Enzyme design. Structure first.
Site, PDB file in Angstrom:
ATOM      1  N   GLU A 243      -1.568  -8.858   2.955  1.00 15.27           N
ATOM      2  CA  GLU A 243      -1.550  -9.524   4.254  1.00 15.27           C
ATOM      3  C   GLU A 243      -2.803 -10.353   4.478  1.00 15.27           C
ATOM      4  OE1 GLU A 243      -0.774  -5.134   5.344  1.00 15.27           O
ATOM      5  OE2 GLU A 243      -1.234  -6.247   3.531  1.00 15.27           O
TER       6      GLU A 243
ATOM      7  N   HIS B 257      -3.425  -4.700  -0.238  1.00 20.64           N
ATOM      8  CA  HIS B 257      -2.877  -5.281   0.969  1.00 20.64           C
ATOM      9  C   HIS B 257      -2.762  -6.796   0.801  1.00 20.64           C
ATOM     10  CE1 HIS B 257      -2.522  -2.355   4.290  1.00 20.64           C
ATOM     11  NE2 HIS B 257      -3.490  -1.640   3.697  1.00 20.64           N
TER      12      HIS B 257
ATOM     13  N   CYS C 223       0.814  -1.219   0.000  1.00 19.36           N
ATOM     14  CA  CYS C 223       0.000   0.000   0.000  1.00 19.36           C
ATOM     15  C   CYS C 223       0.857   1.283   0.000  1.00 19.36           C
ATOM     16  CB  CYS C 223      -1.077  -0.096   1.078  1.00 19.36           C
ATOM     17  SG  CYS C 223      -2.133   1.355   0.894  1.00 19.36           S
TER      18      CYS C 223
END
Ligand code: CTP
Ligand code: CTP
Ligand code: CTP
Ligand code: CTP
Ligand code: MG
Ligand code: MG
Lengths: 559, 372, 186
Positions: free
Chosen positions: B340, B338, B217
């Site tokens: 994650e 993102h 990001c």
């Protein structure tokens, strides 16, 4: 009259007994004639039925009342003498009112546990707190009540009701509640919800708390105190923290840094209690003795190693009074204490057939010791180890104290190893053999504070120098079995001289061996009479001899 | 030294009172529960002693299921909910027992993986590690898949900025020491702007010193700002996310008022050589979760595309830039989504598997494990 | 555990043979010389036992003159070369006794300077520290004058080059770690 009740807990192992024994000490520094009451929720009438394995040693009072350990902690912190009535129990009060029913004193009413039994509790606390406890027959100014169990239980239940009525049957401003409580730490965060779930129950059972004495692992955060003072109604200055410090004799001075005398002086109006200068100046002098002995603990470095030789040494609470008396004697000598736990049965040569490591570690600890103690054991199954440690202490010249059974194994040792009767025996153990060389006899019990008179020639005896050379000694006893008095004329000839005896002359109570630096038997228990500012004279003798400077202690006493 | 079961017995009273009835009593003790402690909890709660599970600490939280499996908890829940009466296919059941062996395998791999990999996580608020919980957990999945044990190096980014040398030299050295020690570097999708110059210096370091790099990001965005200032040669070029009312012409970003959730990323045509496209299995579209108000100013892209900073992936309209990989570096990636949140304990997020592989060495061997 | 004075006694034999006669016997033992060790060296060499100086290790080599001064070596050399007969001005003598106090001061400053300064010395052949002996010694003078204790960080310069990351990453990190840790660079 005034009361402070010490109470509470999320958990029963939380350690209320120091905050009781240490709140009462702080109030004694105002010069007030303080007393204390233990409540124990167990059904035992008195502790004499329950063995020292089962929650620690069997205490003794002046009455002969075999009692809860926690009486002892107040006696030694507060200098007071207690009586067997100061131990309220569920056993006692229910045995009392149920025996009173068969006597008829409720006029044939119902004896509901509300109204009538909670009235007997409130009567018992009001009787007991007016019994005198200091060196003069003056009735107490303030009473500390330690509420055993927890507030929020079923063994506690009549006591917490009785104390809700007692908050009024004695007026508020003559009563205050200190609630000990748990604040766990988990993942680095202080958790005040066990505490907030015992403040809910406290308000419910009807007492209102004054202090919130947390047993956290840490200093309480300023935000932790602020939230406990939001959920309990106490102001944040009153949320005392009782965290660990270098010895338990510091705990009063932590509570004094945490304003607890200034709060209790206000919250019980202690300025309205009548005090003389002989009260007040004794108060402020005792504070300086406590500041001095804690300062002496803070920079005493020179160690003294005392071997405590007996059975069950893994159960250290089986000897709590023995340990505490050595700590008083230590701090008075200004030597730091190490106690060497010698599990006596390991000294016996047969242990070499079972585990050599035990045989070496135990004789290593005994050989390393600067002084030796046979600590008034119970039963008989470790006795040969206690005899070998007495042989060692006599021949190797090491300082020695035998308490109760300790005097008796010293006579058995001396008979077997100096008088030369190897079959001589503890009649306490080897009974139905019916042998002639009996070192002891049964004479069915003998308990409480008794008078010991010194025998006439005794002037040279170090034990008589430690008792200030005064002709009579008042100390607490327990023994079924005593030295067979028909051996005494032999021991008196061989240099084992009976310094002190019972008032009839027929019973032997102290000996000192001639020509040794310090080797003493006492058949009374010297542990129980020690106070934090007045260590028990035989134990002050032992820790002095082991430190060196036994002569310099004999001046500090006799000046 | 004594286990205290009265806080537990004072929450079983309240549980029965509020009206639910408990089945398990899952204690968080500091220890193994004593057999006498369990016996008393099973006397005051009505559960049988087999059901008083202990959930004590073990070498990583991925072991916790297998402790509960040693403590009979499937055999109890199979009985207590009659789970044998639920209809299952062999495609359900064999996926079930295979997933168990993947969990037994990855926990066995954690039990004897020793070869460390150090990843620098470079950002603000690193004392608040839960501010990055998903970032940390994705590196743990990527770690266990590479069979290298993880150390994460917390670089509080503002300490890398040279002005820190005027305030505390110890902070300036410890932070550059941790960054220099790292086998790989991560700019972890920060929030606010006040640490940004440290995150730019770590991106300069990662480009010039060849160290493996992932920008998530904000990480893609400081990588474009770094590349503009230090390769394209515009030292006044700026985060429009920060330096807005100056109204300068070299804007590396623009506001385009929010954009959230799972979105489609399409790879740009020439992308075949890109290690990031090898890690995504060379599939033409990637579905991943987004958050960004500000995105790269698309009027700089034709310059970066000429200088070897190639935008591997874009939004379906073509107008928004979502992945880049720098040509001629071992592994240097920005992702503006993102990565994650989509990582699973048996399926580590492809850019994070890329980073922990490049930092371990054997990035090529991971690219076979994916594409076979 | 025994001090062996036979290598010394086998170089006093050769010294007398090659024809010079010794005055001092300056031993480089690992220890303080025993009083019995000195007494035997003064029996086999012809020097008196006061002259058997010991030159053992001390906290920095700038202390060594003051060990020799505790071991009477100026008082001996003043006698044995009759240095009282050399003509000196007060501008000589007072510069002499002032320089002694500068040496006593800078050695006292070394004895309780604690605040470290880390200087990165960046170059080839750093395993051959004598290839830089004058560089090292100049930093030690500068250190003692600042009253900061010195650590020098040996950065073998070729390890900072990015191609080292292709050969050994440990070298690439240790060298950039030492360079990043340094309070100053050379
Ligand atoms: N002034 C004190 C008070 C207590 N203790 C120690 O405290 C012990 C037992 O704990 P205590 O504080 O008396 O309370 P608990 O036994 O936990 O019981 P309760 O909380 O129910 O009162 C003994 O080991 C004793 O050595 C002490 O050393 N000094
Ligand atoms: N008597 C209370 C106290 C707290 N809460 C709520 O429960 C949440 C979680 O409790 P917690 O935040 O942990 O409060 P503490 O009392 O501090 O609990 P602990 O001490 O265990 O941390 C709080 O945010 C609050 O909204 C509640 O409902 N009732
Ligand atoms: N619900 C309960 C549990 C116990 N007790 C009584 O309280 C005494 C002290 O409680 P404790 O022995 O500590 O019981 P635990 O539940 O183990 O408390 P903890 O887990 O904190 O040790 C017990 O001997 C018992 O007589 C009680 O009244 N009500
Ligand atoms: N110049 C010498 C010195 C010694 N000896 C003899 O050699 C023996 C062994 O030598 P040593 O005792 O070791 O004498 P040192 O000179 O001390 O040897 P070192 O210093 O190595 O101990 C002595 O006892 C002595 O009789 C000798 O013959 N000639
Ligand atoms: Mg219990
Ligand atoms: Mg207690």
């Amino acid at each position: 009259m005034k009361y402070v009740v010490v109470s509470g807990g999320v958990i029963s192992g939380i350690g209320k007994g120091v905050l009781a024994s240490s709140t009462g000490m702080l109030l004694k520094t105002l010069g007030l004639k303080v007393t204390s009451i233990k409540i124990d929720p167990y059904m035992n009438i008195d502790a004499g039925t329950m063995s020292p394995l089962e929650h620690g040693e069997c205490f003794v009072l002046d009455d002969g009342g075999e009692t809860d350990l926690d009486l002892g902690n107040y006696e030694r912190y507060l200098g007071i003498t207690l009586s067997r009535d100061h131990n309220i129990t569920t056993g006692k009060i229910y045995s009392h009112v149920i025996s009173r029913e068969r006597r008829g004193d409720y006029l044939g009413k119902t004896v509901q546990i509300v109204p009538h039994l909670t009235n007997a509790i409130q009567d018992w606390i009001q009787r007991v707190s007016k019994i005198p406890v200091d060196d003069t027959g003056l009735e107490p100014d303030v009473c500390i009540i330690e509420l055993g169990g927890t507030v929020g239980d079923i063994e506690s239940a009549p006591f917490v009701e009785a104390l809700r009525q007692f908050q009024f049957e004695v007026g508020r401003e003559n009563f205050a509640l200190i609630h000990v409580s748990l604040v766990p730490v988990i993942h680095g965060e202080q958790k005040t919800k066990p505490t907030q779930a015992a403040i809910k129950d406290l308000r419910s059972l009807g007492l209102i708390p004054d202090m919130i004495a947390c047993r956290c692992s840490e200093e309480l955060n300023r935000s932790t105190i602020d939230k406990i003072a939001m959920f309990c109604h106490v102001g944040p200055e009153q949320v005392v923290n009782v965290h660990d410090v270098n010895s338990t004799y510091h705990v009063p001075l932590l509570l004094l840094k945490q304003h607890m005398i200034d709060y209790l002086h206000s919250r019980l109006k202690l300025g309205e209690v009548p005090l003389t200068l002989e009260d007040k100046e004794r108060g402020s002098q005792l504070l300086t003795n406590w500041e001095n002995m804690t300062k002496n603990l803070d920079d005493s470095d020179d160690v003294v190693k005392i071997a405590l030789v007996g059975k069950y040494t893994n159960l250290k609470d089986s000897y709590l009074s023995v340990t505490k008396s050595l700590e008083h004697a230590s701090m008075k000598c200004r030597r730091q204490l190490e106690i060497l736990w010698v599990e006596a049965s390991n000294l016996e040569p047969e242990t070499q057939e079972v585990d050599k490591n035990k045989f070496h570690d135990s004789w290593n600890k005994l050989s390393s010791a600067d002084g030796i103690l046979v600590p008034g054991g119970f039963g008989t199954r470790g006795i040969e180890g206690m005899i070998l440690a007495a042989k060692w202490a006599r021949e190797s010249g090491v300082p020695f104290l035998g308490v109760c059974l300790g005097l008796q194994v010293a006579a058995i040792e001396f008979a077997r190893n100096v008088i030369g009767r190897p079959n001589s025996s503890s009649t306490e153990f080897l009974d139905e053999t019916l042998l002639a060389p009996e070192d002891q006899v049964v004479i069915t019990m003998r308990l409480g504070l008794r008078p010991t008179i010194f025998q006439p020639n005794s002037e040279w005896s170090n034990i008589r120098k430690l008792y200030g050379e005064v002709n009579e000694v008042h100390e607490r006893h327990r023994h079924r079995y005593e030295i067979n008095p028909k051996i005494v004329n032999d021991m008196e000839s061989r240099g084992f001289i009976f310094v002190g005896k019972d008032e009839t002359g027929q019973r032997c109570e102290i000996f000192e061996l001639k020509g040794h630096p310090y080797y003493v038997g006492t058949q009374y228990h010297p542990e129980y009479t020690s106070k934090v500012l007045e260590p028990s004279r035989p134990f002050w003798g032992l820790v002095a001899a082991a430190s060196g400077t036994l002569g310099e202690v004999i001046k500090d006493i006799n000046l």
